[PDB]
Amino acid sequence: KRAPYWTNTEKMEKRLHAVPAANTVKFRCPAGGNPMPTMRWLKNGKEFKQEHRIGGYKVRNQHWSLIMESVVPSDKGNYTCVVENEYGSINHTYHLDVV
């Protein structure tokens, strides 16, 4: 029926985030599509794995979100959600700065 598309762009408008260390960070890319699109996250363009940071990370598919607790300076970088189904692939990038 259709390619992925962003449901709420208002949540995604702010691209640059400066947060104090120890804070929790949440990035979201609310999407729609049929079939239901999958979501994956990239850090600086590379597959972002649990082992890539001490606290790992949580993904809540129903909220199209990525969550990192107790952030540290090492967490600085680009975070890109990639949303895809049979009829297309779209992406969006946040930048995280820890202070």
Tab-separated table of N, CA and C in Angstrom:
chain	number	residue	atom	x	y	z
A	1	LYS	N	0.792	-1.225	0.000
A	1	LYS	CA	0.000	0.000	0.000
A	1	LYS	C	0.838	1.296	0.000
A	2	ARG	N	1.866	1.426	0.847
A	2	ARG	CA	2.714	2.633	0.753
A	2	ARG	C	4.050	2.697	1.490
A	3	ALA	N	4.918	3.565	0.973
A	3	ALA	CA	6.272	3.783	1.488
A	3	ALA	C	6.243	4.421	2.867
A	4	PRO	N	7.345	4.285	3.632
A	4	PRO	CA	7.378	4.930	4.949
A	4	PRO	C	7.271	6.452	4.814
A	5	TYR	N	6.735	7.094	5.846
A	5	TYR	CA	6.638	8.544	5.871
A	5	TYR	C	6.623	8.966	7.328
A	6	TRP	N	7.068	10.191	7.590
A	6	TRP	CA	7.105	10.718	8.949
A	6	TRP	C	5.728	11.205	9.389
A	7	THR	N	5.261	10.697	10.525
A	7	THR	CA	3.959	11.081	11.057
A	7	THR	C	4.011	12.464	11.695
A	8	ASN	N	4.936	12.644	12.634
A	8	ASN	CA	5.093	13.920	13.321
A	8	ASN	C	6.492	14.501	13.140
A	9	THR	N	6.606	15.493	12.262
A	9	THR	CA	7.890	16.133	11.992
A	9	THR	C	8.249	17.177	13.040
A	10	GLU	N	7.253	17.598	13.806
A	10	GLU	CA	7.460	18.590	14.845
A	10	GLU	C	8.408	18.080	15.937
A	11	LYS	N	8.284	16.804	16.289
A	11	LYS	CA	9.183	16.181	17.253
A	11	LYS	C	10.608	16.070	16.707
A	12	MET	N	10.743	16.060	15.382
A	12	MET	CA	12.036	15.821	14.745
A	12	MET	C	12.757	17.096	14.303
A	13	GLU	N	12.069	18.230	14.409
A	13	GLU	CA	12.575	19.493	13.874
A	13	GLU	C	13.900	19.927	14.509
A	14	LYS	N	14.017	19.779	15.826
A	14	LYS	CA	15.255	20.105	16.524
A	14	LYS	C	16.290	19.015	16.267
A	15	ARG	N	17.347	19.371	15.549
A	15	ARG	CA	18.355	18.400	15.146
A	15	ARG	C	19.579	18.369	16.055
A	16	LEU	N	19.886	19.499	16.686
A	16	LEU	CA	21.086	19.601	17.513
A	16	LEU	C	20.717	19.628	18.971
A	17	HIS	N	21.274	18.694	19.733
A	17	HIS	CA	20.959	18.582	21.149
A	17	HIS	C	22.215	18.659	21.998
A	18	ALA	N	22.247	19.623	22.907
A	18	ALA	CA	23.328	19.738	23.866
A	18	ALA	C	22.776	19.365	25.233
A	19	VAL	N	23.232	18.243	25.775
A	19	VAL	CA	22.765	17.826	27.089
A	19	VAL	C	23.934	17.679	28.034
A	20	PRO	N	23.708	18.007	29.305
A	20	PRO	CA	24.679	17.777	30.376
A	20	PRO	C	24.867	16.280	30.620
A	21	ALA	N	26.117	15.871	30.829
A	21	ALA	CA	26.437	14.497	31.192
A	21	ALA	C	25.521	13.973	32.301
A	22	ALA	N	25.320	12.656	32.301
A	22	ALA	CA	24.457	11.950	33.265
A	22	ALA	C	22.960	12.014	32.941
A	23	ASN	N	22.576	12.912	32.043
A	23	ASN	CA	21.187	12.982	31.593
A	23	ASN	C	20.752	11.824	30.694
A	24	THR	N	19.445	11.596	30.605
A	24	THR	CA	18.892	10.637	29.651
A	24	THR	C	18.536	11.323	28.336
A	25	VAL	N	18.868	10.690	27.217
A	25	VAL	CA	18.513	11.249	25.917
A	25	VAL	C	17.539	10.339	25.170
A	26	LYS	N	16.544	10.958	24.540
A	26	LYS	CA	15.587	10.251	23.703
A	26	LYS	C	15.464	10.897	22.307
A	27	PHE	N	15.737	10.110	21.273
A	27	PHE	CA	15.534	10.532	19.907
A	27	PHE	C	14.359	9.754	19.342
A	28	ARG	N	13.489	10.439	18.595
A	28	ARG	CA	12.350	9.763	17.994
A	28	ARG	C	12.173	10.086	16.516
A	29	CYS	N	11.681	9.101	15.774
A	29	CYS	CA	11.362	9.269	14.364
A	29	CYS	C	10.018	8.601	14.080
A	30	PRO	N	8.912	9.208	14.549
A	30	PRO	CA	7.583	8.609	14.353
A	30	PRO	C	7.223	8.447	12.866
A	31	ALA	N	6.870	7.220	12.499
A	31	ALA	CA	6.690	6.826	11.108
A	31	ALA	C	5.387	6.078	10.876
A	32	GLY	N	4.984	6.032	9.621
A	32	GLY	CA	3.859	5.246	9.172
A	32	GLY	C	4.250	4.614	7.851
A	33	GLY	N	3.373	3.777	7.315
A	33	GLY	CA	3.680	2.977	6.152
A	33	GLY	C	2.942	1.650	6.207
A	34	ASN	N	2.789	1.020	5.043
A	34	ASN	CA	2.136	-0.278	4.927
A	34	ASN	C	2.791	-1.095	3.824
A	35	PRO	N	3.436	-2.212	4.192
A	35	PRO	CA	3.533	-2.793	5.536
A	35	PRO	C	4.197	-1.875	6.552
A	36	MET	N	3.959	-2.140	7.836
A	36	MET	CA	4.590	-1.376	8.897
A	36	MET	C	6.096	-1.388	8.686
A	37	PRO	N	6.714	-0.195	8.622
A	37	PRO	CA	8.165	-0.106	8.413
A	37	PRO	C	8.978	-0.596	9.620
A	38	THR	N	10.185	-1.098	9.370
A	38	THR	CA	11.132	-1.367	10.446
A	38	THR	C	11.968	-0.131	10.732
A	39	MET	N	12.585	-0.128	11.901
A	39	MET	CA	13.425	0.969	12.330
A	39	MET	C	14.773	0.445	12.786
A	40	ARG	N	15.835	1.113	12.361
A	40	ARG	CA	17.151	0.818	12.885
A	40	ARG	C	17.912	2.111	13.103
A	41	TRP	N	18.886	2.073	14.000
A	41	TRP	CA	19.634	3.258	14.360
A	41	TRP	C	21.114	3.156	14.022
A	42	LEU	N	21.666	4.292	13.625
A	42	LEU	CA	23.036	4.381	13.212
A	42	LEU	C	23.715	5.397	14.110
A	43	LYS	N	24.994	5.178	14.388
A	43	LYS	CA	25.806	6.183	15.048
A	43	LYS	C	26.916	6.500	14.080
A	44	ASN	N	27.049	7.782	13.729
A	44	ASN	CA	27.986	8.214	12.691
A	44	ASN	C	27.957	7.309	11.465
A	45	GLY	N	26.762	6.941	11.033
A	45	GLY	CA	26.600	6.176	9.808
A	45	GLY	C	26.793	4.670	9.926
A	46	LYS	N	27.190	4.197	11.105
A	46	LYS	CA	27.451	2.778	11.294
A	46	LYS	C	26.408	2.137	12.204
A	47	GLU	N	26.123	0.862	11.966
A	47	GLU	CA	25.151	0.154	12.781
A	47	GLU	C	25.513	0.384	14.256
A	48	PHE	N	24.526	0.807	15.045
A	48	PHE	CA	24.715	1.153	16.450
A	48	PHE	C	24.344	-0.074	17.277
A	49	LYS	N	25.353	-0.722	17.840
A	49	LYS	CA	25.162	-1.944	18.626
A	49	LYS	C	25.181	-1.683	20.141
A	50	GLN	N	24.486	-2.537	20.891
A	50	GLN	CA	24.454	-2.490	22.360
A	50	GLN	C	25.826	-2.359	23.008
A	51	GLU	N	26.796	-3.066	22.455
A	51	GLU	CA	28.138	-3.080	23.005
A	51	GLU	C	28.917	-1.799	22.712
A	52	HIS	N	28.326	-0.882	21.941
A	52	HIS	CA	29.037	0.337	21.547
A	52	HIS	C	29.091	1.411	22.634
A	53	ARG	N	28.331	1.231	23.714
A	53	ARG	CA	28.425	2.127	24.869
A	53	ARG	C	28.072	1.337	26.113
A	54	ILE	N	28.723	1.675	27.219
A	54	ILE	CA	28.595	0.918	28.456
A	54	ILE	C	27.148	0.662	28.889
A	55	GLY	N	26.304	1.688	28.855
A	55	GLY	CA	24.933	1.497	29.296
A	55	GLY	C	24.012	0.819	28.287
A	56	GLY	N	24.540	0.464	27.108
A	56	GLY	CA	23.716	-0.002	26.000
A	56	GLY	C	22.652	1.040	25.667
A	57	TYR	N	21.542	0.606	25.075
A	57	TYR	CA	20.455	1.524	24.745
A	57	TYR	C	19.132	0.780	24.626
A	58	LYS	N	18.038	1.519	24.727
A	58	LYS	CA	16.716	0.930	24.602
A	58	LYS	C	16.010	1.468	23.362
A	59	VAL	N	15.351	0.578	22.633
A	59	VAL	CA	14.485	0.981	21.537
A	59	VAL	C	13.028	0.592	21.828
A	60	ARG	N	12.123	1.569	21.756
A	60	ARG	CA	10.687	1.301	21.878
A	60	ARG	C	10.004	1.500	20.517
A	61	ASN	N	9.716	0.398	19.831
A	61	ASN	CA	9.196	0.442	18.464
A	61	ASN	C	7.877	1.171	18.337
A	62	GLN	N	7.037	1.042	19.357
A	62	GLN	CA	5.725	1.682	19.352
A	62	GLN	C	5.854	3.204	19.421
A	63	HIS	N	7.011	3.669	19.876
A	63	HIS	CA	7.248	5.100	19.994
A	63	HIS	C	8.341	5.545	19.043
A	64	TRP	N	8.820	4.614	18.215
A	64	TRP	CA	9.826	4.912	17.200
A	64	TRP	C	11.006	5.643	17.806
A	65	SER	N	11.417	5.210	18.997
A	65	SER	CA	12.368	5.973	19.797
A	65	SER	C	13.646	5.220	20.141
A	66	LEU	N	14.699	5.996	20.363
A	66	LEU	CA	15.964	5.496	20.859
A	66	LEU	C	16.258	6.228	22.160
A	67	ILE	N	16.726	5.486	23.161
A	67	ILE	CA	16.944	6.025	24.500
A	67	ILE	C	18.298	5.607	25.087
A	68	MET	N	19.081	6.602	25.491
A	68	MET	CA	20.369	6.382	26.129
A	68	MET	C	20.348	7.025	27.511
A	69	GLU	N	20.606	6.230	28.550
A	69	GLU	CA	20.625	6.743	29.919
A	69	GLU	C	22.031	7.155	30.322
A	70	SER	N	22.119	8.085	31.276
A	70	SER	CA	23.384	8.537	31.862
A	70	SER	C	24.411	8.800	30.805
A	71	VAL	N	24.163	9.794	29.959
A	71	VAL	CA	25.030	10.020	28.827
A	71	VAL	C	26.402	10.524	29.270
A	72	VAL	N	27.418	10.178	28.482
A	72	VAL	CA	28.800	10.555	28.751
A	72	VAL	C	29.403	11.193	27.492
A	73	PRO	N	30.488	11.982	27.655
A	73	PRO	CA	31.092	12.675	26.505
A	73	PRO	C	31.351	11.761	25.320
A	74	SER	N	31.648	10.498	25.592
A	74	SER	CA	31.875	9.513	24.527
A	74	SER	C	30.648	9.298	23.634
A	75	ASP	N	29.473	9.670	24.136
A	75	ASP	CA	28.225	9.517	23.396
A	75	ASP	C	28.033	10.547	22.286
A	76	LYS	N	28.847	11.613	22.292
A	76	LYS	CA	28.786	12.647	21.244
A	76	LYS	C	28.795	11.994	19.879
A	77	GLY	N	28.025	12.557	18.946
A	77	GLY	CA	28.032	12.069	17.572
A	77	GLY	C	26.726	12.233	16.811
A	78	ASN	N	26.669	11.676	15.610
A	78	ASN	CA	25.433	11.691	14.840
A	78	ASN	C	24.578	10.434	15.051
A	79	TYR	N	23.283	10.628	15.301
A	79	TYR	CA	22.357	9.507	15.438
A	79	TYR	C	21.276	9.538	14.375
A	80	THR	N	21.259	8.504	13.537
A	80	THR	CA	20.375	8.455	12.369
A	80	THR	C	19.417	7.277	12.484
A	81	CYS	N	18.119	7.554	12.500
A	81	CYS	CA	17.113	6.496	12.380
A	81	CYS	C	16.931	6.202	10.886
A	82	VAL	N	16.718	4.934	10.558
A	82	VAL	CA	16.457	4.520	9.189
A	82	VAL	C	15.192	3.681	9.203
A	83	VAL	N	14.185	4.146	8.484
A	83	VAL	CA	12.880	3.528	8.498
A	83	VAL	C	12.581	2.992	7.107
A	84	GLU	N	12.264	1.702	7.005
A	84	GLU	CA	12.159	1.061	5.689
A	84	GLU	C	11.083	-0.016	5.577
A	85	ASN	N	10.468	-0.090	4.403
A	85	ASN	CA	9.632	-1.224	4.035
A	85	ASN	C	9.854	-1.553	2.553
A	86	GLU	N	9.007	-2.410	2.018
A	86	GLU	CA	9.153	-2.900	0.662
A	86	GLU	C	9.201	-1.757	-0.361
A	87	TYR	N	8.537	-0.640	-0.051
A	87	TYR	CA	8.379	0.454	-1.011
A	87	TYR	C	9.220	1.691	-0.757
A	88	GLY	N	10.223	1.603	0.111
A	88	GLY	CA	11.066	2.761	0.340
A	88	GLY	C	11.823	2.796	1.644
A	89	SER	N	12.751	3.738	1.722
A	89	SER	CA	13.605	3.896	2.877
A	89	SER	C	13.832	5.392	3.110
A	90	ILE	N	13.591	5.867	4.327
A	90	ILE	CA	13.840	7.264	4.661
A	90	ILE	C	14.643	7.361	5.949
A	91	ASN	N	15.349	8.473	6.113
A	91	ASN	CA	16.191	8.673	7.270
A	91	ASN	C	16.220	10.111	7.767
A	92	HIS	N	16.692	10.265	9.001
A	92	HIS	CA	16.743	11.544	9.673
A	92	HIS	C	17.874	11.474	10.684
A	93	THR	N	18.606	12.574	10.854
A	93	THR	CA	19.784	12.564	11.715
A	93	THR	C	19.769	13.625	12.821
A	94	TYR	N	19.987	13.177	14.059
A	94	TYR	CA	20.201	14.081	15.180
A	94	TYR	C	21.690	14.187	15.471
A	95	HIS	N	22.107	15.293	16.079
A	95	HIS	CA	23.473	15.376	16.579
A	95	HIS	C	23.459	15.591	18.069
A	96	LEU	N	24.229	14.761	18.754
A	96	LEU	CA	24.276	14.820	20.197
A	96	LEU	C	25.608	15.360	20.687
A	97	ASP	N	25.509	16.402	21.504
A	97	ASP	CA	26.647	17.010	22.151
A	97	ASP	C	26.451	16.895	23.667
A	98	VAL	N	27.435	16.323	24.350
A	98	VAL	CA	27.349	16.126	25.799
A	98	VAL	C	28.281	17.118	26.483
A	99	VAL	N	27.782	17.809	27.507
A	99	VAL	CA	28.542	18.886	28.144
A	99	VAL	C	28.719	18.682	29.655
